[PDB]
Design a protein around this ligand. Structure first.
Ligand SMILES: *[C@@H]1O[C@H](CO)[C@@H](O[C@@H]2O[C@H](CO)[C@@H](O)[C@H](O)[C@H]2NC(C)=O)[C@H](O)[C@H]1NC(C)=O
Ligand SMILES: *[C@@H]1O[C@H](CO)[C@@H](O[C@@H]2O[C@H](CO)[C@@H](O)[C@H](O)[C@H]2NC(C)=O)[C@H](O)[C@H]1NC(C)=O
Ligand SMILES: *[C@@H]1O[C@H](CO)[C@@H](O[C@@H]2O[C@H](CO)[C@@H](O)[C@H](O)[C@H]2NC(C)=O)[C@H](O)[C@H]1NC(C)=O
Ligand SMILES: *[C@@H]1O[C@H](CO)[C@@H](O[C@@H]2O[C@H](CO)[C@@H](O)[C@H](O)[C@H]2NC(C)=O)[C@H](O)[C@H]1NC(C)=O
Ligand SMILES: *[C@@H]1O[C@H](CO)[C@@H](O[C@@H]2O[C@H](CO)[C@@H](O)[C@H](O)[C@H]2NC(C)=O)[C@H](O)[C@H]1NC(C)=O
Ligand SMILES: *[C@@H]1O[C@H](CO)[C@@H](O[C@@H]2O[C@H](CO)[C@@H](O)[C@H](O)[C@H]2NC(C)=O)[C@H](O)[C@H]1NC(C)=O
Ligand SMILES: *[C@@H]1O[C@H](CO)[C@@H](O[C@@H]2O[C@H](CO)[C@@H](O)[C@H](O)[C@H]2NC(C)=O)[C@H](O)[C@H]1NC(C)=O
Ligand SMILES: *[C@@H]1O[C@H](CO)[C@@H](O)[C@H](O)[C@H]1NC(C)=O
Ligand SMILES: *[C@@H]1O[C@H](CO)[C@@H](O)[C@H](O)[C@H]1NC(C)=O
Ligand SMILES: *[C@@H]1O[C@H](CO)[C@@H](O)[C@H](O)[C@H]1NC(C)=O
Ligand SMILES: *[C@@H]1O[C@H](CO)[C@@H](O)[C@H](O)[C@H]1NC(C)=O
Ligand SMILES: *[C@@H]1O[C@H](CO)[C@@H](O)[C@H](O)[C@H]1NC(C)=O
Ligand SMILES: *[C@@H]1O[C@H](CO)[C@@H](O)[C@H](O)[C@H]1NC(C)=O
Ligand SMILES: *[C@@H]1O[C@H](CO)[C@@H](O)[C@H](O)[C@H]1NC(C)=O
Ligand SMILES: *[C@@H]1O[C@H](CO)[C@@H](O)[C@H](O)[C@H]1NC(C)=O
Ligand SMILES: *[C@@H]1O[C@H](CO)[C@@H](O)[C@H](O)[C@H]1NC(C)=O
Lengths: 204, 221, 168, 148, 50
C-alpha cells in the first residue's frame, strides 16, 4: 500500500546512485580519475582528456537536474492535491464524488508519513438493497403530490415516502409532499390516500 | 482591434429581478486527452545500429542507456495508469436491459451497438473515424479499444439505470425519469418541473444529441 | 543495408533506382541485373521481457518478445498483438488482470501450476434490473475507512557542481 | 564516431526530455479527466463550468483514440421576465422571508417562486418564515400572507 | 584520495585491500605496511549560507 511513498524514495535514491556512478565513467577520456590523468600527463596533454571528462560530468549533472525538476513538478502536483484534500476532506466534508474515497464522504483524518501524507477517509457506503415499486407522484384529490425530501416507494400494497439513501418508510402526509399541477400531465403517477394531520385534529 | 463581445448593460435596479420562464437541455462536448502512444527506444540500436565498434565506444558513456530506457518505460506505465484511472472507475460491468424505456430519452446514439463487431456506440464510431523502425518501437496499450468501449458502456449503463448510486457502492436501479427529477433537485429546480415537462425535456435532449452527432460528423476541428 | 527483401507491388518509374519514405530510409530497391522491384523490411527486432511470478512463489517464467511474429524466434507459443509469448499456456477462461502483458492480455501463475495468459476480464458483469417503476433503496450501511497515500515532498538534494565535476 | 555518438545521444536525451514534459502534461489532463468522470459522470457536480456551461444535469463518457469525450447535459435557463422583488413582506408587523425562493410581483400581486424557474405561488406561511419586526429590513414591502 | 582515516572494525579478508560501496568510492583501505583496516571519510564540507 505504501508504495506511492516508497517508490518516490527509491526514485530519488536511484538518481543519486546513477549520478555518483557517472563519476566512474571514461566518457572517452583515458581514465575516469582526474588525479591519475594529472599525474600521468602534462597539462597540455591532460587538458584534452579533462575536457571530455568535464563535458561528460556536466552533461550528467544537467540530466540529473532536469529529471529532478520534472520529478519535483510531479511531487508539487501531488502536494497541491494533498493540500486540496486536507482543506476539503479534513477541514470539511467534500460533496465531490470519489475525491475523498469511494462512497459518500463522512470525514477524513491526516497521518504523516516519510515524505508524504496519508488520509484515512471515513465514508458511508449503503449495503443492503431492497426492491420497491416507485411512482414519481401521487394523486389524492386530482392534485399530483411530489415528495418534498425523499421518494415514493411501495412494499406491494401501501405507499411510503422514504429518504433516498436509507430505507426509512414513512406515511405519506401533506407535510412530506407538496402539490404542483393536476394528474393529467405526469407519467407514471398513481392513486393513493395522502393522510392529512389536521383532519383528525379538526374532527375532535 | 478585436472586440471582446457585445456590450450588454444589465438592467439592474435595486428592486428588479429577472426570473427565467423556460429552459434548454444543452448537450455540450468536452474532449480530453488521457494517454499518449507508448513508445520505447532501444538506445544501442538507435545510436550504434549494428556496429560492434560503435557499441564499444558507446559503452564508455556510463548508465545513459539504462536511464533513458527507464524514463521511457516509466512514461509507458504512466500511460497505462492514466487510462486505468480514467476509465476503470466501475467495479462491475453494468449492461442496459433489452427494454429501452428511459422516460422518452433516446440513448441509442451512445449506447453500445451490437451490430458492429466491436461493441462501440455510434458517436464513438464517429469519434474514432474523425481522429486519424530504427530502434524505435511503439508498444501497444494494455486496454484495447474494445475494452475501453466496454468500460464506457458500463459507465453509461450504470448511470442511466442507477443515477449516481453506482459511484458510491452497489448500483441501485431507479427509473430514469426519477433520476432526472433528482438531477433537477440538485440544481435548485423543484422536481415537479421535470415531471410536468418530461416530454419537452426528452425532445430537447434528443435534439441536442442529434446536434452533437452532426457537429462531430461535419466539423473535425 | 540489412533487411528482408520481398517481392513488391510498387510501380517504380523506369529511371528510379531506390525508394525512400518519411524517414528517408531505403524502403524499396531495384535489382540491378533483373529490373524487378523489392520491398525492404527491417530485420525483426524488439524488446524481450520476462513474465515471472515472484521468485518466492516460483522460478518458472515466460518470455515475451514484443511486437515480433512467432516465426523469427529460435524456438507453448502464443501469438498476441503484444508479441510472441513463450512459456504461457493460453486459457480461454478470463480472470482479472494479474501481470499485464498488453493488448488486453494478462498473464497469471495458476493451476502442476503454470503461467497462463488470458484476455483479461473487466470485472464481473452485473445487469441492473432496471424498469420504469422499480427503485432499489438500501436498508443498511457500512462505515468504510479507506486509505489514500499521497507524496507531499521529496529529498532536498543540493549538488556542489564544482566539487562534483572537478573534485579537488 | 565520437562526434556521431555525442550528437545522437544529445538527440535522444532531447527527445526523452520533451517526452517527459509532454507526458506530465498528458497526466495532468488524465487526472482532470478522471476527476470529471468521478464527479460529472458518477455524480452531479455543483462546481460551476466544471461539467459544462450551465447547471450540470449529467454526463456521458465516450471513448476516443487516446482520450475521452464527455457529453455534458446541462440545464440553461432560456426566457427571462422582469419582476419587482421585495426582500421580505409584512403581514402583521413581522417581516416574512421566503424559505426557498424569491418574492416577485407581476404588477399587482405578489408571488413566491423558486429562483431558477418561474413557478409563482400564492404566499402562505408555509412558503415563508418570520424573523423580527418590520422596521429593519431595507426594501421590505406590505402584503398579506395567506394562512391555510 | 583525500579524507580522514579512522580505525575501522570492518573484517577485511586477507587478500582484499580496498572497501567500496554502492557509490563505487573507496570507503576503506588496508594499510600496506601494517596490515590494518582504515575507514576513509570525505573531508567535512558543506554549503555556507548567511
Ligand atoms: C407493507 O407494509 C405495511 C405497513 O407495515 C403492512 O401493513 C401492516 O402489516 C402488519 C404485518 O406485517 C400488520 O400488523 C399491520 O396491521 C399492517 N398495517 C396496515 C395499515 O396494513 C403490509 O402488510 C406490508 N405489505 C407487504 C406486502 O409487505
Ligand atoms: C385514479 O383515480 C381517478 C379517479 O379517482 C381515475 O379516473 C377515472 O378514470 C376512468 C378511466 O379513465 C374514468 O372512467 C373515470 O371517470 C375517472 N374518474 C374520475 C373521477 O374522473 C383514474 O383512472 C385512477 N387511476 C389509476 C391508475 O387507478
Ligand atoms: C432514437 O434515435 C434514432 C435515430 O436518431 C432512431 O432511429 C430511427 O428510427 C426510425 C424509426 O421509424 C427510422 O426510420 C430511422 O431510420 C432511424 N434512424 C437511425 C439513424 O437509425 C430511434 O428510433 C430513436 N429511438 C426512440 C425510442 O425514439
Ligand atoms: C419553452 O421552450 C421550448 C423550446 O425550447 C418550447 O417548445 C417548443 O414550442 C413550440 C411552440 O410552443 C413548438 O413549435 C416546438 O416544437 C417546441 N420545441 C420543443 C423542443 O418541444 C416550449 O413551448 C417553451 N415553453 C414555455 C412555457 O415557454
Ligand atoms: C445492518 O448491518 C449491521 C452489520 O453491518 C448489522 O449488525 C450486525 O447484526 C448481526 C445480527 O444482529 C450481528 O451478529 C452482528 O454482530 C452485527 N454487526 C455489528 C458490527 O454490530 C445490523 O443488524 C443491520 N441492521 C439492519 C436493520 O439490517
Ligand atoms: C397578476 O397575476 C394575478 C394572479 O395570477 C392576476 O389576477 C387575475 O387576473 C385575471 C384577469 O383576467 C382574473 O380573471 C383572475 O381572477 C385574477 N386572479 C386573482 C387571484 O385575482 C393579474 O391579472 C395579473 N396581472 C398582471 C399585470 O400580470
Ligand atoms: C405597511 O403598513 C403599515 C401599517 O399598516 C404602514 O405604517 C403606517 O405608515 C403611515 C405613514 O407612514 C403612518 O401614518 C402609520 O402610523 C403607520 N402605521 C403603522 C401601524 O406602522 C407602512 O407605512 C406600510 N408600508 C408601506 C411600504 O406602505
Ligand atoms: C429486484 O428484482 C429483480 C427481478 O429480476 C431481481 O433480479 C433483483 O435481484 C431484485 N433486487 C434485489 C436487490 O434483489
Ligand atoms: C412501464 O413500461 C411498460 C411497458 O414497458 C408500460 O406498460 C407501463 O405503463 C410503464 N409504466 C411506467 C410507470 O412508466
Ligand atoms: C546481364 O543481365 C541481363 C538482365 O536480364 C541479362 O539480360 C544479360 O544477358 C546479362 N548479361 C550477362 C553477360 O550476364
Ligand atoms: C512468499 O510470499 C508469501 C505470500 O505471497 C509470504 O507469506 C511468504 O512469507 C513469502 N516468502 C518469503 C521468503 O518472503
Ligand atoms: C505471422 O506470419 C504468418 C505467415 O508469415 C502470418 O500468417 C501471420 O498473420 C503473421 N502474424 C501476424 C500477427 O501478423
Ligand atoms: C478456446 O475456444 C475456442 C472457441 O471458443 C477454440 O477454438 C479453442 O480451441 C479454445 N482453446 C482451448 C485451449 O481450449
Ligand atoms: C427588463 O427591463 C429592461 C429595462 O430596459 C429591458 O431592457 C428588458 O427588455 C426587460 N426584460 C424583458 C424580458 O423584456
Ligand atoms: C431604489 O432606488 C431608488 C432610486 O430611484 C430609491 O428611490 C429607492 O428608495 C431605492 N429602494 C431601496 C429599497 O433602497
Ligand atoms: C616492513 O613492514 C612490516 C610490517 O609490519 C614489518 O614487519 C617489517 O619489519 C618491515 N621491514 C622493514 C625492513 O622495515
Amino acid at each position: 500500500a505504501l508504495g506511492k511513498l516508497q517508490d518516490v524514495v527509491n526514485q530519488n535514491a536511484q538518481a543519486l546512485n546513477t549520478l555518483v556512478k557517472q563519476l566512474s565513467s571514461n566518457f572517452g577520456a583515458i581514465s575516469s580519475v582526474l588525479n591519475d590523468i594529472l599525474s600521468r600527463l602534462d597539462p597540455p596533454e591532460a587538458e584534452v582528456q579533462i575536457d571530455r571528462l568535464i563535458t561528460g560530468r556536466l552533461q550528467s549533472l544537467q540530466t540529473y537536474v532536469t529529471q529532478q525538476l520534472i520529478r519535483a513538478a510531479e511531487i508539487r502536483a501531488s502536494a497541491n492535491l494533498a493540500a486540496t484534500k486536507m482543506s476539503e476532506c479534513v477541514l470539511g466534508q467534500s460533496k465531490r464524488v470519489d475525491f475523498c474515497g469511494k462512497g459518500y464522504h463522512l470525514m477524513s483524518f491526516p497521518q504523516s508519513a516519510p515524505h508524504g501524507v496519508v488520509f484515512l477517509h471515513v465514508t458511508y457506503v449503503p449495503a443492503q438493497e431492497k426492491n420497491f415499486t416507485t411512482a414519481p407522484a401521487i394523486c389524492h384529490d386530482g392534485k399530483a403530490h411530489f415528495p418534498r425530501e425523499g421518494v415514493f416507494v411501495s412494499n406491494g400494497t401501501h405507499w411510503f415516502v422514504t429518504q433516498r439513501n436509507f430505507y426509512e418508510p414513512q406515511i405519506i402526509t401533506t407535510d412530506n409532499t407538496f402539490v404542483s399541477g393536476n394528474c393529467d400531465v405526469v407519467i407514471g403517477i398513481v392513486n393513493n390516500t395522502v393522510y392529512d394531520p389536521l383532519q383528525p385534529e379538526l374532527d375532535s | 482591434t478585436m472586440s471582446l463581445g457585445v456590450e450588454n448593460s444589465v438592467a439592474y435596479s435595486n428592486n428588479s429581478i429577472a426570473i427565467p420562464t423556460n429552459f434548454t437541455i444543452s448537450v455540450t462536448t468536452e474532449i480530453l486527452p488521457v494517454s499518449m502512444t507508448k513508445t520505447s527506444v532501444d538506445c544501442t540500436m538507435y545510436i550504434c545500429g549494428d556496429s560492434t565498434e560503435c557499441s564499444n565506444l558507446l559503452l564508455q558513456y556510463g548508465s545513459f542507456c539504462t536511464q533513458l530506457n527507464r524514463a521511457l518505460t516509466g512514461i509507458a506505465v504512466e500511460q497505462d495508469k492514466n487510462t486505468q484511472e480514467v476509465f476503470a472507475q466501475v467495479k462491475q460491468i453494468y449492461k442496459t436491459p433489452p427494454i429501452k424505456d428511459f422516460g422518452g430519452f433516446n440513448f441509442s446514439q451512445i449506447l453500445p451497438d451490437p451490430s458492429k463487431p466491436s461493441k462501440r456506440s455510434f458517436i464513438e464510431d464517429l469519434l474514432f473515424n474523425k481522429v486519424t523502425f530504427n530502434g524505435l518501437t511503439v508498444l501497444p496499450p494494455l486496454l484495447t479499444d474494445e475494452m475501453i468501449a466496454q468500460y464506457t458502456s458500463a459507465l453509461l449503463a450504470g448511470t442511466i439505470t442507477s443515477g449516481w448510486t453506482f459511484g458510491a457502492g452497489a448500483a441501485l436501479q431507479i427509473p430514469f425519469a426519477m433520476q432526472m427529477a433528482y438531477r433537477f433537485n440538485g440544481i435548485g429546480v423543484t422536481q415537479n418541473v421535470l415531471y410536468e415537462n418530461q416530454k419537452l425535456i426528452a425532445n430537447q435532449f434528443n435534439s441536442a444529441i442529434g446536434k452533437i452527432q452532426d457537429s462531430l460528423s461535419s466539423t473535425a476541428s | 543495408g540489412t533487411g528482408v527483401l520481398t517481392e513488391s507491388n510498387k510501380k517504380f518509374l523506369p529511371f528510379q533506382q531506390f525508394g525512400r519514405d518519411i524517414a528517408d530510409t531505403t524502403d524499396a530497391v531495384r535489382d540491378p541485373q533483373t529490373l524487378e522491384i523489392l520491398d525492404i523490411t527491417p530485420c525483426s527486432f524488439g524488446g524481450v521481457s520476462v513474465i515471472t511470478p515472484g521468485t518466492n512463489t516460483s522460478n518458472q517464467v515466460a518470455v515475451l518478445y514484443q511486437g515480433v511474429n512467432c516465426t523469427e524466434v529460435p524456438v507453448n507459443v502464443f501469438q498476441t498483438r503484444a508479441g510472441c509469448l513463450i512459456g504461457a499456456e493460453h486459457v480461454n477462461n478470463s480472470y482479472e488482470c494479474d501481470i499485464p502483458i498488453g493488448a488486453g492480455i494478462c498473464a497469471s501463475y495458476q493451476t502442476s501450476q503454470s503461467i497462463i495468459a488470458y484476455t483479461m476480464s473487466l470485472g464481473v458483469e452485473n445487469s441492473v434490473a432496471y424498469s420504469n417503476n422499480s427503485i432499489a433503496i438500501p436498508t443498511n450501511f457500512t462505515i468504510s475507512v479507506t486509505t489514500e497515500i499521497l507524496p507531499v515532498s521529496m529529498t532536498k538534494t543540493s549538488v556542489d557542481c564544482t566539487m562534483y565535476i572537478c573534485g579537488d
